[PDB]
Design a protein around this nucleic acid. Structure first.
Length: 49
DNA sequence: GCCGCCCTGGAGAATCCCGGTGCCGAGGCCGCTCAATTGGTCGTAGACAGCTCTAGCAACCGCTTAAACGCACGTACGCGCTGTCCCCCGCGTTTTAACCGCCAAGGGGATTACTTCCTAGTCTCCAGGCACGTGTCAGATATATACATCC
């Protein structure tokens, strides 16, 4: 998911634009992947429960 | 008639038992004597109470995922048997030194008593080192943007 679908141009080395619009995740992968998700300029967060 | 040989009885000496007396191990008694006891005083160690903050605990949840478990196979190793040879054990003989009993004098060290003085405990006062918290600063890291180039 991270290398095939996050980036429109994952083959580049500079700034990578986002390809998706909404990302669904759970709490376990929020804590497991803090480093791979914190460096994303999010526009909106919706936390259920 | 005279001389030599076999059978049997009572008195002299050795041994067991008992009593009187002297010597070794241990306990009661006495004397010194120093350390435990008793009595009193006082300071403080610790018990108790109180408040605050953090860790643990019982019993439940949910998710992930790597470790545990079960099973099949295979093969390596534990184990048993046999041979062999060699080295340790048993014994007889000879040596030798440990052990015990001896000088010969001298120093080391354990006590007993005494003297002295240096150094460490104790007390008071003070200050700086250690513990904690924070502002700031230079090295490391990531990316923004401009230039040369291949297809």
């Amino acid at each position: 998911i991270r290398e095939y679908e996050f980036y429109t141009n994952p083959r580049a080395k500079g700034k990578k634009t986002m390809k998706f619009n909404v990302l669904l995740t759970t709490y376990e992968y929020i804590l497991k992947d803090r480093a791979e998700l914190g460096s994303i300029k999010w526009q909106f967060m919706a936390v259920d429960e």
